[PDB]
Design a protein around this ligand. Structure first.
Ligand SMILES: [K+]
Ligand SMILES: [Mg+2]
Ligand SMILES: [Mg+2]
Ligand SMILES: [Mg+2]
Ligand SMILES: [Mg+2]
Ligand SMILES: [Mg+2]
Ligand SMILES: [Mg+2]
Ligand SMILES: [Mg+2]
Ligand SMILES: [Mg+2]
Ligand code: NA
Ligand code: NA
Ligand code: NA
Ligand code: NA
Ligand code: NA
Ligand code: NA
Ligand code: NA
Ligand SMILES: [Zn+2]
Lengths: 47, 71, 88, 63, 112, 132, 254
RNA sequence: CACGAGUUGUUCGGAAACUGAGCACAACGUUAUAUCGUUUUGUUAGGAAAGUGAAGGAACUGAAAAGGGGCAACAGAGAACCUGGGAUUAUAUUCCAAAAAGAAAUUGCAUGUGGG
RNA sequence: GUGGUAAUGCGGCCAGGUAACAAAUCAAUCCUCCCACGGUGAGCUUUCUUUUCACCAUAAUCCACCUUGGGCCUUUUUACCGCGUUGUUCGGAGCGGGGGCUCAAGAUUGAAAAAUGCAUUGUGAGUUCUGCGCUAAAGCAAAAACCUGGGGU
RNA sequence: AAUUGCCAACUCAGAACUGCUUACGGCGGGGAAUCCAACUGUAUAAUUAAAACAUAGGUUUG
């Protein structure tokens, strides 16, 4: 997940926490390094 | 956390390339200089106010200084 | 003072198993909880640790013999014969 | 208030006792207290050299 | 008065799951696990099984990460036998070898 | 026993338990510093190893080296044997311990004498190790 | 009817021995070259008690004949054995309590234990608490020895089978009355599932040949034949005689 | 009942990686028939069940080691982390960001220093 | 590798040890409850009450280094008498006195740590882990993993 | 020192005065005999808990 995060969006992830949901899907919480703004990345993604 | 016994040793530690920052705590009696190195926190306890001010105003370049206050 | 007239260590059974069986078990119980003589170390130091195991805390030693006593009467004949044959 | 009264000894009579004498104050505790007191006194006297070893041993046995 | 709960997902009071009560700087009472202990380094069981002088009783990771002084002594058989056992073995070795030499020399002198 | 200088003893207590030594100097009069009878002992803390044929002279010497110690020991802490190693009055006079310098010099002299004796080939039992 | 209990026990389902706490089979040394042509010396290390057995067991340490190693054996202790004792096994052994020697070398009239029936069996006779054999005679022509077994019968064995000198330890055990059902409970908890014992006359006809009736009785003689099928062979089996014996007691056995 | 949400771990529990009462794959035997039996009292099987250390002149090659492979304990053995939070609507010894609120312990591989 | 008379400081193979194991009695630390002194807030107050209630906290991980319970060393040697427990015992196979080495559990000083939390610092009782070393014809599971030594290398 | 101070924790015993409407809860009725089984135990889940079964002790058989 870290490698894919870096490849898809040119950002660096310092932590990934994962859980599998009661409906069967897997969800990840990805924290970016302080050199990157998650708000800027979210705007680029289109959130 | 480890405690330093001498000013020379404290100066060497503060000059160590891994020393990230130096925090200064002003107690009603003594002054504590806490150096955050990579693995440990080193604290030097100084009793004399004049000596403590001399060290604080002295030069420890390239290391950030933090004044510990209640936030 | 004396605490029982004749029913000694067997006084823990109450009135419960018959006079003759208690009298028969008393001798073996007394001998099994007694302290026996140690030929080495020359003193009374042997104590039972299980049905045939006797242990002397002075010399730090364990000996095999007897269920409720250190030496059976049958073994005396064996030791006497062995010593005599060795003497010959 | 009742505790001060009972410290003066007011509500601990025959008609108020409900448990056995040994339940209220066991005898083994009394014996251990007494014997330890006596042994402490004997040791102090022997140390202060009021009595000798010969007298001490006899008193230690009779206690 | 306050009452406490288990915190480490095992809820049985066995000899390995022992707990102690602690009051924290935040003024609450919690449960903390009590570590298991060891009996220490001993003399061989057939020779008496006595605790050896100069050695420490350390558990698994502590024994792995400690230094040699803690678990041994500078004498011979350090950390295995005691001083009296070592002395007895030394004397027995010397005396037995002397008896053997004398007996063999006597046999050879009778032969020749 | 009869503790004379030149006799061979076996240490039974302490770090050097089981090693062999020679009585350099005996003294049976108690003092305030040492309230016991004692002797000065010159033992060997490193026995010469075993040498077989087909060995280079370098390794032969390296494995024929020996090492010594010089200490004062209580009478109870060694056992006396019937063997002897010759010690002269001149050698005993040259041996002494009163400071670090004197101790080191005496130790070097004792080691040299022992190496000479082992090379000469006398007193083989003294240089064999005790297996226990 | 249904299966009888003595036949149910032959499947050995819940009727097998309780052996988790046992230490292993007790046996003499292996009959090898050193024992056949000389002697070996061992030292007694410890004396222990094993659940379900009345005698003591001894741990004896030897040296491996061929490798650099130590070998520990487990035998049944004779009476008098102590820790630190030296034990000799083989041909050239002396005569003392605990030594293992051939029967041809043991003198006539001696008391032995742990006897081998066939050379190499590692001991099968006289192994319970206070038992022993007696050597009766030697016969140098055929190389056989006659003994008196603990039961009173006489048996001839080859002179090459080994035996140990002395008497087994733990004697006098059955002289103490038990007095309680709890004591029997604890005695059999270390052996096997065989206690308590119900009576055939107290069972029902579907279960036992003796069960049933308006009074508790056996309707037929309780002496049964040697050729009876399993399930019919309950009672006194192939008895030669019954009742209380008046006079001398003979030996029992074939 | 309808719609929308919620479970975050180098260290907690398990597995990776122990053995127990026990089970039964291989091998062998038996059966018209394997869908049967033996298989821990050191211990398969008439039974050739070991596949790599050091080597020397970068991988290959082969000496020494009797007794085949595996499972069975979320209460036995084993097991490197603790507090504070104004941090949720619902999770937390799992979340908190450069003054990490913070302070530690431990594993693998590398780099400098000192000693050797 | 190296100090101390010593107990014992400090820088393939083979043999042992830890893991590893009952009851009772008596007695610590932690925690809980109570009492006595103070400080802060609230309640009662026709009358009485120097009063009633609540609170006054300190995690892991680390430095330096006194008690009381075992084992031992050295010195002076014990006349069937001496030592010791609530309790069933110990002594020329080494009692007691002087001086020491070591282990287990606690205490203290400090770093953490006030920068946090909330709106003091002394007694008595009860309870755990711990220590007091280790019924029975019933006598206290095993292995991995790890530790130390003997040798050779 | 067989003397002086300072302090804790509760228990037992004795006395004078005074009162009862016998007043929470909790807590064995006792004695003399006969039958059976020695005793503690087990045991027909859902009409039988016993004098039945077990037991220690005794004897016989292979
Ligand atoms: K099968
Ligand atoms: Mg997860
Ligand atoms: Mg019926
Ligand atoms: Mg619904
Ligand atoms: Mg577990
Ligand atoms: Mg875990
Ligand atoms: Mg919740
Ligand atoms: Mg108790
Ligand atoms: Mg009845
Ligand atoms: Na009493
Ligand atoms: Na029938
Ligand atoms: Na009947
Ligand atoms: Na009948
Ligand atoms: Na198994
Ligand atoms: Na498993
Ligand atoms: Na019924
Ligand atoms: Zn003895």
């Amino acid at each position: 997940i870290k490698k894919a995060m870096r490849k898809l969006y040119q950002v660096k992830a310092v932590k990934v926490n994962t859980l599998i949901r009661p409906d069967g899907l897997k969800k990840a919480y990805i924290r970016l390094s302080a050199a990157h703004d998650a708000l800027d990345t979210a705007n680029k993604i289109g959130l | 956390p480890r405690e330093i016994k001498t000013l020379k040793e404290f100066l060497a530690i503060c000059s160590r390339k891994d020393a990230r920052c130096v925090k200064v705590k002003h107690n009603p009696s003594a002054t504590k200089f806490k150096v955050r190195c990579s693995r440990y926190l080193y604290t030097l306890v100084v009793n004399d106010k004049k000596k403590a001010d001399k060290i604080e105003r002295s030069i420890h370049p390239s290391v950030k200084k933090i004044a510990v206050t209640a936030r | 003072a004396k605490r029982t007239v004749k029913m000694g260590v067997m006084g823990r059974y109450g009135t419960r198993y018959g006079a003759n069986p208690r009298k028969r078990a008393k001798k073996l119980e007394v001998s099994q909880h007694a302290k026996h003589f140690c030929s080495f170390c020359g003193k009374f130091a042997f104590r039972r640790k299980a049905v045939g195991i006797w242990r002397c805390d002075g010399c730090s030693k364990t000996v095999a013999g007897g269920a409720y006593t250190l030496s059976t009467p049958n073994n005396s004949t064996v030791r006497s014969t062995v010593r005599r044959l060795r003497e010959l | 208030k009742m505790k001060e009264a009972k410290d003066m000894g007011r509500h601990n009579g025959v008609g108020r006792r409900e448990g056995s004498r040994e339940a209220r104050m066991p005898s083994k505790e009394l014996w251990m207290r007494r014997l330890r007191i006596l042994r402490r006194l004997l040791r102090k006297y022997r140390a202060d050299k009021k009595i000798d070893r010969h007298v001490y041993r006899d008193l230690y046995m009779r206690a | 008065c306050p009452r406490v709960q288990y915190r480490r997902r095992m809820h049985y009071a066995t000899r390995g799951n022992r707990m102690k009560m602690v009051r924290t700087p935040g003024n609450k009472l919690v449960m903390q696990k009590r570590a298991k202990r060891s009996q220490g380094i001993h003399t061989p069981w057939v020779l008496g099984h006595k605790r050896l002088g100069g050695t420490k009783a350390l558990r698994h990771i502590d024994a792995r990460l400690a230094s040699r002084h803690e678990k041994s002594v500078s004498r011979a058989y350090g950390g295995v036998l005691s001083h009296d056992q070592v002395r007895d073995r030394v004397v027995r070795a010397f005396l037995v070898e002397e008896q053997r030499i004398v007996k063999q020399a006597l046999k050879e002198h009778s032969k020749m | 026993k009869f503790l004379k200088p030149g006799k061979v003893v076996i240490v039974t207590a302490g770090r050097y338990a089981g090693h062999k030594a020679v009585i350099v100097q005996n003294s049976d009069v108690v003092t305030k510093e040492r309230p016991y009878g004692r002797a000065l002992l010159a033992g060997i803390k490193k026995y010469p190893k075993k040498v077989v044929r087909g060995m280079s002279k370098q390794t032969i010497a390296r494995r024929s080296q020996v090492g010594v110690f010089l200490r004062v020991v209580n009478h109870k802490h060694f056992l006396p044997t019937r063997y002897n190693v010759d010690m002269s009055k001149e050698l005993r006079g040259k041996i002494n311990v009163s400071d670090a310098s004197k101790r080191s010099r005496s130790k070097r002299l004792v080691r040299h004498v022992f190496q000479a004796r082992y090379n000469a080939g006398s007193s083989m039992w003294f240089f064999q190790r005790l297996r226990f | 009817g249904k299966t009888v209990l003595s036949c149910r026990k032959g499947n050995g389902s819940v009727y097998q021995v309780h052996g988790h706490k046992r230490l292993g089979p007790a046996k003499l040394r292996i009959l090898d070259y050193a024992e056949r042509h000389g002697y070996m010396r061992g030292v007694v290390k410890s004396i222990e008690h094993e659940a379900g057995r009345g005698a003591a067991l001894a741990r004896v340490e030897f040296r491996h004949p061929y490798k650099f190693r130590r070998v520990k054996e487990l035998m049944v202790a004779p009476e008098g054995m102590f820790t630190g004792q030296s034990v000799f096994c083989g041909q050239k052994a002396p005569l003392a309590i605990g030594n293992v020697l051939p029967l041809g070398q043991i003198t006539e009239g001696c008391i032995v234990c742990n006897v081998e029936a066939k050379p190499g069996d590692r001991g099968t006779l006289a192994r319970a608490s206070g038992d022993y054999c007696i050597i009766i005679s030697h016969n140098h022509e055929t190389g056989r020895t006659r003994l008196k077994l603990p039961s009173g019968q006489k048996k001839s064995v080859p002179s090459t089978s080994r035996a140990m000198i002395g008497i087994i330890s733990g004697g006098g055990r059955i002289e103490k009355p038990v007095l309680k059902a709890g004591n029997s409970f604890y005695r059999f908890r270390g052996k096997r599932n065989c206690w308590p014992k119900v009576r055939g006359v107290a069972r029902n006809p579907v279960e036992h040949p003796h069960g049933g009736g308006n009074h508790q009785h056996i309707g037929h003689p309780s002496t049964v034949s040697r050729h009876s099928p399993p399930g019919q062979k309950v009672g006194l089996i192939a008895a030669r005689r019954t009742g209380r014996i008046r006079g001398g007691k003979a030996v029992k056995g074939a």
